[PDB]
Design a protein around this ligand. Sequence first.
Ligand SMILES: Nc1ncnc2c1ncn2[C@@H]1O[C@H](COP(=O)(O)OP(=O)(O)NP(=O)(O)O)[C@@H](O)[C@H]1O
Ligand SMILES: [Mg+2]
Length: 329
Amino acid sequence: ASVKVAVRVRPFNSREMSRDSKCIIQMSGSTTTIVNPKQPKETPKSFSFDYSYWSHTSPEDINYASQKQVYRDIGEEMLQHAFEGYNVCIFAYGQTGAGKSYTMMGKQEKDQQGIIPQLCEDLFSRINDTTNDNMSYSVEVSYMEIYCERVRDLLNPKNKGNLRVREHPLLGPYVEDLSKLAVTSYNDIQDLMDSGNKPRTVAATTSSRSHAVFNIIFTQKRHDAETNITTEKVSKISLVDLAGSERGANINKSLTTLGKVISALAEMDFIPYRDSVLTWLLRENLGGNSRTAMVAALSPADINYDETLSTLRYADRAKQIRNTVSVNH
Ligand SMILES: Nc1ncnc2c1ncn2[C@@H]1O[C@H](COP(=O)(O)OP(=O)(O)NP(=O)(O)O)[C@@H](O)[C@H]1O
Ligand SMILES: [Mg+2]
């Protein structure tokens, strides 16, 4: 199962309009072409991707990609693998201010919800539409923050101590004492989501330097009538919103390493998964038993050409990543 990759271009931001920025990003079909505003006559660079989201204009535009449409595409696709029993992972990557959070979390207001809110709703909606009484479900959630290789339990602010990332001798990495709460309804998991988004530390001492990881352990129990054993079907849903690649540093280790892992996997001995908390935890999502997808946010502005071309190249490498996947039953 190769890593699926989507790119999404947002509208101009205040910094760009103030510089009379021109749009150097062009989308057609599954192709994305970027123009070099420095070398206009150089041949433009095109990239092929599984999903191309043109969100530079507005919803009044027939060719605009909305939150809903982005979700209903790669969002339902991954949620369905989850239902199939696969571990799943969707992570947003890109330049600081490119639109990673808008894509993953969006705005809790009218029409603006991102992939995480929409997936949670869909997940509960589907569970509640189950008509087979032999099927029962359990949804547990965890939300954390990674900043300077330090882990914070976003579902438990009261705790001011950063959690320890460990390696279970047989079950893989995991954050110690990370809250894992059970929720029986969309509203509950949404109130937990809002609570977590408020606890997040983006203060002002500027732009996001931390990564957020939203984990849902979705368990499907099937009851067999004749003998009383209950087969469990488990799938972990990891929704990641990283810090912008932006434009001794322990504030950026995870990001730099993430790029190395991505490239070394695309090249495929040995990978620095352990060089950073971010790559250590998501090890299995990167090169392991997981259905993984990347969503690459991109500025449409000429002033961000290097940053955006950089993104497109890492987005391109990810596509080359292949993971051995097996349903968990
Ligand atoms: N598709 C979109 N439509 C409308 N506004 C958008 C869209 N994508 C991003 N934005 C806005 O542009 C800014 C970038 O948002 P997000 O907040 O999405 O950035 P990152 O998450 O790109 N930033 P950072 O964490 O600092 O690297 C925000 O003010 C968003 O409201
Ligand atoms: Mg952000």
